[PDB]
Symmetry: D2
Subunit: 249 residues, 4 copies
């Protein structure tokens, strides 16, 4: 009886309720943001999250993201920065994760992000060590803080436990905390505690997000190379493809 | 009786009340953000705003800014982007402007910003035309929208009316509106309507802010050139210096 | 295929999401408030609201109510007021109504209520004329305002349209409006507009609520007569019984 | 240099900022609520609170109250309840108390209240023992909980320390806590902790408030006796009169 898609009813209720929660928290959600790309399920085997529902507390990789801003910030740049513009830009989005669910392990080669918890608490799992890029020297300034070891008993999604292996550092973020930075090239993932009485709601402020999603299919590229560029590298293969399309029946 | 400074009492009450308002609106204001640099008065002649107070509705150039994030985002960048890093980075801050007061005319050579109104309404004045930079070619993608002509009867600060001359385009932003982008190299200014029952509260999400302020004096520079760099160019000279220091008695 | 109950999953998701929305809006929802009595479906034939779900926009009589306060306020009263205490007391609750759904036609003999819209907009239907009580004289002071006629095209629940007949006055309430009073002995009902992007969330502040609900079964009565007293009189019979118990499968 | 009044500027800034804070927290504050009666200073000697200001942390008895509802709830009552109506009714208001300031010791003969902390934390001081009323028997049901002893080092207003003597029970309330009931005939007072980074903001939901205030001078009485009735009994005489009028210069 393994689910392989989400019904139109389950999708709309999931996304509409989330938008309402976001609006209650004063996030500027416009109509075009509430679309068939907002609800993300990372892989066919993750649709089983809708067997018992988003309030079961079971570990699955699915989440909602409402993108209010994804600006290239290319205008006004000296032409010499053209090849480096993809590392800049401005992206603002509201992320909603239900109890026990995860934004799965992945890293970005160009995108650096920051987190601001609005509601609930955020458990971030990450590698304090950045990845390298064969043949190219990289700059360094602050690097990532080491953080703490994982707490006991973190239930991971079935069949994807090994994907969290390298994300050894842990940090629990709460509303009102200082902004937390996740530098590019660092593996990261996060979940909403399973016992949370509310969905985790976090605002991400980061550099440009290169994601050829369904709701993105059709946009114009500010610079040639950008077109089709996918700056997401999920440890789990099923996650990389799932990210770009949701199966709604 | 022209004021040339703000008393410790006026400053603390101004800044503390603003922080409380920000907290009520769920902005993550930490203790280090509530400092002697948060309250900005753009020039000695602007201290007269405290003759009748922040609720008089009189046109003066003063505002409060609580910076929660100003990340260089240099880590993980290929060394070749070093000279262009100053155009990137991530800056998040809450800006509070009282009735009739202004964030004065200025432009940034490197910083691109975006606005999200949280409380009240924001009246933005700007030049749809970007400035040029002698000897260097610049990229273009979306440019700035033209906007509308100024509404009738906008009271400008005394002795600084000519500084708003080139900012011919006008746009009134409200809570819930789409994010509004202010590209680098564009002159811009904004105020809270004089008849507003509440201070204007807006969240700015932009690229790195190069501002050698008092509360900034002492930070480490990620890249040599950055040290001491001031990416603010106010049309009014008194505004450029005032920005970097508040006179508290 | 007519539904006659709501599944445990549908109930929990409905109520849990609503509690989260309430919490986001700063309403003090404690654990004991999130129970099997919070989600109300007014009659077996109204369970069909869960055929297409709470976001279908279809007209059904169901709602969520989180009661934070229901205080008798009998302590300190002169004994002579004993027979009149049931008209006083203090009740505070958060009511959540989804698009197109209704809090059905009914009146209270003792309870006077007031409304404060927190999110969305509230459409109130009521009789400006109070009901009488055979054999007893009643006091008068302000009475109810007449209001406006119903707007065109209000979809009512199937088979219950006649129950709204006498509720001729209409008023649409919004967040920030003056408190709206619904005097006891006045027929009233309300819904969330079908095109609302968010569930209607309203805070009711009223006198004591005499409702022998399931989650109420077991409380102590401050005064003999109060025990078992049901101060709700729904025009629709199915509504009176449904109110006191939800069928969860 | 002892202050004996508050300047128009100090008053407006105090009240306007508070209204903005209330609005940010979604309390329905209308224009008529922002008047010359909202800011309360309990006695001529308490105006010294404005010597160093509302952010000094000094112990003074002053506060802001925005009343959104004060409904007699007399309509629909059987005539026999006329003499007991004054114990009922509905009153909703937002109370704002700055760091270290107090809502001074007092009790009500008819009014029962409840508290809901919206921002900050509330320290309530009260007598678990109700007062008696010569010649009249009173009802009892739940009475007041005993609470805890006062914490160490509570700074009381100068020259009014003895007024807090009988208020031996203490309870610290926070946002999200269960509603707290203060039965009529119980002495009570409260303050915002002196080290609070934000003003204390609390919503009071109670029975009718009989207060012949300045902004009240002119209202119609639903029942003869009510006219001019003052249901406030402050332990400090200067507090009883101060409550009804603010000296603005
Ligand atoms: O359109 C939006 C906001 O809905 C984003 O996807 C970006 O295009 C904003 O620049
Ligand atoms: O410290 C803060 C936030 O208070 C900012 O000034 C930046 O340093 C954050 O990166
Ligand atoms: O317990 C509560 C709040 O959850 C109400 O039902 C009343 O009992 C409060 O007095
Ligand atoms: O007018 C108001 C709300 O501003 C109160 O004083 C009461 O009159 C409401 O019934
Ligand atoms: O409007 C979309 C929807 O929620 O409305 C009815 C159906 O259930 C579908 O899922
Ligand atoms: O395409 C719009 C929409 O139907 O898609 C997802 C969301 O539910 C919204 O209602
Ligand atoms: O009141 C909530 C809000 O500010 O947040 C989003 C929605 O657009 C609305 O403007
Ligand atoms: O609204 C946010 C979003 O889901 O919509 C388009 C893009 O895919 C982004 O993830
Ligand atoms: O880490 C957060 C995030 O990058 O992960 C998935 C989605 O792209 C979102 O922006
Ligand atoms: O040291 C290399 C590595 O294994 O460590 C960190 C990064 O995730 C990369 O995979
Ligand atoms: O105990 C935590 C942990 O060791 O278990 C799985 C994950 O890889 C993480 O490193
Ligand atoms: O704490 C700072 C301050 O507000 O406290 C007292 C004095 O007025 C000064 O302005
Ligand atoms: O330096 C800290 C501080 O005194 O400076 C400004 C703000 O009022 C805060 O209290
Ligand atoms: O409740 C308001 C809040 O979320 O906003 C800022 C403060 O830190 C607090 O956490
Ligand atoms: O807290 C924000 C701020 O005022 O503090 C330091 C810097 O000057 C910035 O403008
Ligand atoms: O336009 C907004 C702003 O750039 O103007 C002044 C301050 O630097 C703030 O960040
Ligand atoms: O055309 C050049 C200019 O005058 O127009 C726009 C920019 O402000 C610059 O000053
Ligand atoms: O009327 C608006 C305006 O023309 O007046 C002053 C400012 O320069 C602006 O362009
Ligand atoms: O916890 C209750 C529940 O939501 O969890 C799993 C099952 O679906 C049930 O409805
Ligand atoms: O009885 C508690 C509960 O299961 O009942 C309704 C709500 O969903 C809550 O989880
Ligand atoms: O932050 C939201 C909140 O104030 O509202 C309800 C919950 O208890 C929490 O305290
Ligand atoms: O929590 C609110 C409530 O649903 O719980 C008990 C009572 O029935 C009331 O209606
Ligand atoms: O009119 C609102 C209400 O009285 O109707 C049903 C429930 O009792 C709620 O309190
Ligand atoms: O006049 C009597 C009546 O029909 O009118 C109002 C009330 O609802 C009652 O039913
Ligand atoms: O058109 C509105 C109306 O006449 O139609 C049904 C309901 O009785 C109401 O009075
Ligand atoms: O509008 C009232 C006021 O604030 O405006 C100017 C003067 O200071 C007075 O206090
Ligand atoms: O009378 C109205 C008013 O002036 O009185 C107090 C408040 O400041 C408001 O502005
Ligand atoms: O957005 C804040 C608000 O809801 O609270 C009071 C003001 O009227 C406004 O409607
Ligand atoms: O707005 C609330 C209030 O101050 O205004 C009138 C009455 O005095 C009450 O205390
Ligand atoms: O205890 C709160 C209160 O009764 O004390 C003063 C004012 O009357 C307010 O309503
Ligand atoms: O026992 C009588 C008394 O002293 O105790 C409680 C009440 O305050 C009254 O003053
Ligand atoms: O220590 C607390 C206390 O004993 O001191 C003063 C007040 O009367 C209170 O009872
Ligand atoms: Co990421
Ligand atoms: Co700027
Ligand atoms: Co009712
Ligand atoms: Co009181």
């Amino acid at each position: 009886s393994a689910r392989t898609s989400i019904t139109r009813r389950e999708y709309d209720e999931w996304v509409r309720e989330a938008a309402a929660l976001g609006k209650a928290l004063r996030y500027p959600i416009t109509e075009k943001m509430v679309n068939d790309s907002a609800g993300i399920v990372f892989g066919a085997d993750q649709y089983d999250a809708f067997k018992n529902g988003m309030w079961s507390g079971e570990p699955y990789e699915a989440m909602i993201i409402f993108e209010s801003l994804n600006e290239p910030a290319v205008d006004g740049l000296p032409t010499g920065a053209a090849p480096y513009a993809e590392y800049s830009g401005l992206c603002d989005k509201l992320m909603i994760v239900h109890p026990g669910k995860f934004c799965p392990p992945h890293h970005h080669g160009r995108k650096t992000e920051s987190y601001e918890v609005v509601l609930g608490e955020m458990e971030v799992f990450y590698s304090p060590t950045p990845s390298a890029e064969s043949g190219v020297e990289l700059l360094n300034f602050s690097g990532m803080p080491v953080g703490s070891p994982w707490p006991e008993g973190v239930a991971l999604p079935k069949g994807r436990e090994s994907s969290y292996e390298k994300l050894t550092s842990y940090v629990r973020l709460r509303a009102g905390d200082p902004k937390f930075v996740m530098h590019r090239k660092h593996l990261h993932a996060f979940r909403c505690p399973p016992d949370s009485d509310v969905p985790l709601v976090v605002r991400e402020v980061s550099t440009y997000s290169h994601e050829p999603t369904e709701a993105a299919a059709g946009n114009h590229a500010p610079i040639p190379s950008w077109l089709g560029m996918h700056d997401n590298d999920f440890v789990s293969d099923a996650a990389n493809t799932g990210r770009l399309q949701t199966a709604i029946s």
